[PDB]
Scaffold this motif. Structure first.
Motif, mmCIF file in Angstrom:
data_model
loop_
_atom_site.group_PDB
_atom_site.id
_atom_site.type_symbol
_atom_site.label_atom_id
_atom_site.label_comp_id
_atom_site.label_asym_id
_atom_site.label_seq_id
_atom_site.Cartn_x
_atom_site.Cartn_y
_atom_site.Cartn_z
ATOM 1 N N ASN A 108 0.802 -1.209 0.000
ATOM 2 C CA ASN A 108 0.000 0.000 0.000
ATOM 3 C C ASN A 108 0.837 1.263 0.000
ATOM 4 O OD1 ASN A 108 0.685 -0.758 2.731
ATOM 5 N ND2 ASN A 108 -0.547 0.988 3.335
ATOM 6 N N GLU A 109 2.130 1.144 0.048
ATOM 7 C CA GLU A 109 3.014 2.277 -0.066
ATOM 8 C C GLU A 109 3.103 2.695 -1.526
ATOM 9 O OE1 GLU A 109 6.646 1.937 2.142
ATOM 10 O OE2 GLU A 109 5.664 0.845 3.758
ATOM 11 N N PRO A 110 3.367 3.971 -1.797
ATOM 12 C CA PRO A 110 3.443 4.456 -3.171
ATOM 13 C C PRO A 110 4.605 3.827 -3.914
ATOM 14 C CG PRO A 110 4.141 6.084 -1.662
ATOM 15 C CD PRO A 110 3.437 5.098 -0.868
ATOM 16 N N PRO A 111 4.614 3.858 -5.253
ATOM 17 C CA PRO A 111 5.655 3.134 -5.990
ATOM 18 C C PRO A 111 7.049 3.665 -5.788
ATOM 19 C CG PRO A 111 4.362 4.449 -7.447
ATOM 20 C CD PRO A 111 3.623 4.410 -6.186
ATOM 21 N N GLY A 112 7.213 4.903 -5.341
ATOM 22 C CA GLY A 112 8.540 5.363 -4.993
ATOM 23 C C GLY A 112 9.054 4.731 -3.721
#
Lengths: 71, 538
Positions: B216-220
């Motif tokens: 659920n963390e952003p792709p960065g």
């Protein structure tokens, strides 16, 4: 229906409204999770949400990836 | 000193009127509900940098203050991070206080230079028999782990963490790149019970650092969390001087996350749809995992093959870096063989006689030959019959089946729920133990004597005990006791066994509930910022 919520973003609704309906259905269902009860969320056609989100992203001129989907 | 200029999804452009931050520098957004860290991706011109966010950008306003930290993302490294869970930007997510940082290191780093490289090539001894014989691990190598679910991958991860810490004295870093949070919690709790992670006052006796970037963390955030795992393992290599294990859990999700941040940065995708920088997004990570003159990092990284296509550019670019594969199979796992390493599918570049020696090589080359000749006749046995074929083809079947059993091994981290103690098996005891089964010094011993044992000094001590067992089965007798009214009640006596279950018609649905009154008027903000009803006409 005495245990069920229905969040309905139908076909004539705007693509922003079908994108946000699994999230707004989840927040309604997260009420029972956060207060000790148990929830059952069903995102019927989550593949139709992603088509609605691809519509918003190509129209916002965000750069498309595979099958024109966003990053 | 810089202010937010654009917010387009996870991609933030910020604007610096002074000097720009360098590319890959870390920027912190001043005043936001969560600590938002941006990593500078490019200098756009007109005093603007383009950044990829490590958290959510919702709630971000154009003109928000953004502070340059003057450096890339700096994470706590050292022995104080052992047994802790850490996210990509270095914060503890295990809820056990701050991280005792021996130093704070930049997660961006060039690979060790050519003179710093080790020209030698040698075995990382793992104490697992099937791994040390048939697919040896290069010290400083990259190992693809082709497991899955229920093949005992997690107990194999924790056994590699155990045996490298016990024998070679090196610590481990687990970088979970884009992992499910249910599975990342499962690995945390199984490391706690198996003893490789300790909590509280004995935190320092832990052997593994967990570096987690969840799905659920952003792709960065997922694209950099494997470099946060590198940086923790590079401190143990370069300052502590150790032989570190690094587990990049799903190197494919590293590729997949870096492919998303190129797509969000507006880059034209390459062949099948990966980033144009796929070989240098992988090669930037994989080249920091090497052997230097100080110590070593060995990487056991799990490989997903998309669409079961080995010629897909994400495994094909990954397999150029991999020095061994360990394939965990379900077919080996349902035979009770643990660890479920497939003895024929598992490969190593370290398996050639110029680097492990000819006495090790011919044993592993001979063991694989025996298992191969047994499994191509399994449409000879089922079709024709067991006692159909020759006595020499039955001599292989008897020799392979007690080789296929002897690749099993009990694990020291699994003994808290299995009872059987763990067996670290040395390398010379593995070769000399498998010379004998190959020649035939143990053709008289049963096959289940070769099962879950340490070495060949323990196969004899298992055939002795089982053979005697027939001397100690005439101790007692075995028939029926009191057919079905010994303690088996009547069925209507069992309905009155049933305990009281209090069923409330009330749901208890207003425990601690606010119940705000929401009005269906449209509330807007006027130009003062004051909340006001929506004005009437357009």
């Amino acid at each position: 229906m005495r245990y069920t919520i229905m969040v309905s973003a139908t076909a004539s609704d705007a693509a922003p409204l079908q994108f946000l309906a699994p999230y707004s259905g989840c927040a309604m269902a997260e009420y029972f999770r956060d207060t000790g009860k148990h929830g059952l969320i069903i995102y019927d056609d989550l593949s139709k949400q992603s088509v609605a989100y691809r519509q918003m992203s190509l129209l916002l001129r965000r750069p498309p990836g595979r099958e024109a989907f966003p990053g | 000193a810089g202010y937010v200029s654009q917010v387009i999804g996870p991609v933030v452009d910020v604007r610096f009127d002074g000097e720009l931050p360098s590319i890959l520098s870390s920027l912190e957004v001043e005043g936001h509900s969560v600590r938002l860290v941006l990593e500078v991706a490019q200098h756009m011109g007109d005093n603007t940098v383009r950044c990829i966010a490590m958290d959510s950008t919702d709630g971000l306003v154009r003109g928000q203050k953004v502070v340059d930290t003057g450096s890339p993302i700096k994470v706590p490294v050292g022995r104080g991070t052992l047994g802790r869970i850490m996210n990509v930007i270095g914060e503890p997510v295990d809820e056990q206080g701050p991280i005792d940082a021996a130093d704070i290191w930049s997660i961006h780093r060039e690979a060790p230079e050519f003179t710093e490289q080790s020209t030698e090539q040698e075995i990382l001894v793992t104490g697992i028999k099937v791994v040390d014989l048939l697919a040896p691990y290069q010290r400083g190598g990259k190992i693809g782990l082709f497991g899955g679910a229920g093949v005992g991958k997690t107990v194999l991860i924790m056994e590699l963490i155990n045996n490298v810490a016990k024998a070679h004295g090196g610590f481990s870093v687990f970088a979970g790149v884009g992992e499910r949070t249910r599975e990342g919690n499962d690995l945390y709790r199984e490391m706690i019970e198996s003893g490789v992670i300790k909590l509280g006052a004995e935190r320092g006796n832990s052997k593994c650092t967990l570096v987690y970037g969840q799905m659920n963390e952003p792709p960065g955030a997922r694209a950099r969390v494997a470099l946060t795992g590198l940086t923790v393992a590079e401190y143990f290599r370069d300052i502590e001087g150790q032989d570190v294990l690094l587990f990049v859990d799903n190197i494919f999700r590293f590729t997949q996350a870096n492919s998303e941040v190129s797509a969000l940065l507006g880059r034209i995708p390459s062949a099948v749809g990966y980033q144009p920088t796929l070989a240098t997004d992988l090669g930037g990570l994989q080249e920091r995992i090497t052997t230097t003159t100080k110590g070593s990092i060995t990487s056991v990284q799990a490989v997903y093959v998309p669409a079961d296509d080995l010629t897909d550019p994400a495994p094909a670019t990954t397999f150029a870096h991999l020095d061994a594969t360990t394939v965990l199979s379900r077919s080996i796992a349902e035979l009770g063989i643990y660890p479920a390493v497939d003895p024929l599918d598992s490969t190593s570049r370290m398996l050639n006689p110029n680097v492990i020696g000819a006495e090790h090589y011919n044993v592993a080359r001979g063991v694989q030959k025996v298992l191969q000749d047994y499994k191509n006749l399994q449409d000879i046995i089922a079709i024709l019959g067991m006692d159909e074929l020759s006595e020499e083809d039955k001599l292989t079947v008897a020799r392979a089946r007690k080789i296929q059993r002897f690749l099993s091994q009990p694990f020291q981290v699994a003994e808290v729920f299995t009872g059987t103690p763990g067996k670290y098996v040395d390398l010379a005891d593995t070769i000399s133990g498998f010379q004998g089964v190959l020649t035939g010094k143990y053709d008289d011993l049963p096959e289940m004597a070769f099962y879950m044992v340490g070495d060949i000094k323990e196969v004899k001590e298992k055939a002795d005990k089982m053979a005697k067992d027939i001397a100690s089965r005439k101790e007692a007798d075995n028939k029926k006791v009191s057919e079905e009214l010994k303690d088996i009640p009547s069925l209507d006596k069992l309905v009155s066994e049933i305990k009281e279950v209090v069923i409330e018609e009330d749901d208890g649905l207003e425990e601690d509930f606010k119940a705000e009154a929401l009005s269906s008027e449209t509330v807007v903000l006027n130009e003062e910022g004051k909340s006001v009803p929506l004005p009437k006409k357009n």
